[PDB]
Amino acid sequence: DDCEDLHLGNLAHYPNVLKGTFPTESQVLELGETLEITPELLNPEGATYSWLVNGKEYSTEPTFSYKIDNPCRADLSCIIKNKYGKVEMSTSFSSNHNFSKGFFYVADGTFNFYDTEKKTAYQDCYASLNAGKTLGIGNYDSANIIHSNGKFYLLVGTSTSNRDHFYIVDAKTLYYENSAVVGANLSGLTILNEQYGLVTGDGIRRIDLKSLNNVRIKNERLLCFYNSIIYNGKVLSNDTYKDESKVKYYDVNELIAAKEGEAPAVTELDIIQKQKINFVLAKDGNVYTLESADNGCNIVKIKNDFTLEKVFANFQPAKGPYHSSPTIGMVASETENIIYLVSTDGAIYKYILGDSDSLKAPFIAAESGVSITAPLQLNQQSGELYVTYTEERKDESKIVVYSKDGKVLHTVDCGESVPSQILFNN
Ligand SMILES: [Ca+2]
Ligand SMILES: [Ca+2]
Ligand SMILES: [Ca+2]
Ligand SMILES: [Ca+2]
Ligand SMILES: [Cl-]
């Protein structure tokens, strides 16, 4: 087979890459694996390489080595150049990861993933899966996310006007879908249904969850739904972080139909609030919130007909001092008649609907000089409670994952960056 058919003397002078020495199909690797591509040149003398990861030059080496140490997806090009010509091959690579095997946590202005099976944290999964895209959440900015319709709807509360404030991120994959401008200093987000949401902060804005156009329905300086919920065709809102205010509700259909400036009717419920507190849908099918009282708080049951049942809790609820400080929110179980809530000392109470005895002592005791600085989250499949703690004196935050029985299962070190929210991909 000496000199017969194809040989070097008849195959051009630009780089000649041997077949199969560069992937012809998209690569899928496990977390921890390394992608290695070593193109073999028939004529390698004087050749130079350029490896582009998502269009950005990563290497000039004749062999590509890239550790898949984070959930990612990337486009890969290889430009091989010599005196006589330039050749370019392209492929793509991604990690074989499962975002069902743990939870996302919003810290240092991005989506981070913690695997409860591997006990491993992956920082800034949003960038590595979206070609370096950022969500632009600065230190003095807020991230308000609602997981609905299999999407993460993010509202950035920022003083910058000419930037995207509202983002749609796929909840299962963490893939960016769309984003748009709404307005500066807007930190109140409500998802009404599959088609519409509400953005509050300077009154009420309806946002179309497909086109991302918004209509300013009500214009009221500093009017913000710090917390809200959809219940029996109404939007229940918490619009205070300090001042005495009552829970107010709006009609979902009136909010959907309202034209620019047509402020909708607002009705008050006999629920005095003097701080940020959320609304939780409990296993009894009712909505619960808290009412501010002199020597504690009241766990308020909001029935379908919007009548109220109130149970006194001899403890003050956890609170942040500023407009920017997040809601130290409650969390309800979907499988048990339970609500977890945080006292002002950093203790967790497990309220058992209808039984006021469950409020006589904390479920999880407080630790001195340690406070709970984010809303509670619960894993509805295991019953695991995710609590965000901050050591006041050193500014070191952690996510502690407790079992149904209150035993520590995981500790996620977050350092100087406080996680604001915990999300699931399902
Ligand atoms: Ca190697
Ligand atoms: Ca109605
Ligand atoms: Ca009892
Ligand atoms: Ca850890
Ligand atoms: Cl609209």
Automatic annotation (TrEMBL):
Keyword Metal-binding assigned: yes
Domain of life: Bacteria
Metal-binding among keywords: yes
Residue ranges of domain Bacteroidetes PKD-like in the record: 22-72
One term of GO molecular function: metal ion binding
Keywords noted in UniProt: Calcium, Metal-binding
Protein name: Quinonprotein alcohol dehydrogenase-like protein
Species of the source: Bacteroides thetaiotaomicron (strain ATCC 29148 / DSM 2079 / JCM 5827 / CCUG 10774 / NCTC 10582 / VPI-5482 / E50)
